[PDB]
């Protein structure tokens, strides 16, 4: 059911609230709302067994 989003790039977290990404990970995107991520241009999601925020430009739909 949940839409497919793919990490375009590696992302190394700067905090425990940030999601680590590796290029080509399928990322479960949980919100695009800045009021939920707390940081304009950041989304919330789950990958790697962690939930957290990442910069929105790091994933693409499909």
Residue numbers in the entry: 41 to 102
Sentences from the study reporting this entry:
The SH3 domain has been implicated in the autoinhibition of the kinase domain through an intramolecular interaction via a nonconsensus single proline motif located between the leucine zipper and CRIB motif in the full-length MLK3 protein.
We solved the X-ray structure of the apo MLK3 SH3(44–103) domain at 1.5-Å resolution and refined it to an Rwork/Rfree of 18.6%/21.7%. The sequence alignment of the SH3 domain of MLK3 and five other human SH3 domains (Src, Fyn, Eps8, p67phox, and Grb2) revealed that the n-Src loop sequence of MLK3 SH3 contains an elongated insert of five residues. The residues that extend the MLK3 n-Src loop form a 310 helix, which is not commonly present in SH3 domains. Comparison of the unbound and ligand-bound structures of MLK3 SH3 domain revealed a closed and open conformation of the n-Src loop, respectively. As modeled in Fig. 5B, the closed conformation of the loop precludes the peptide from the groove.
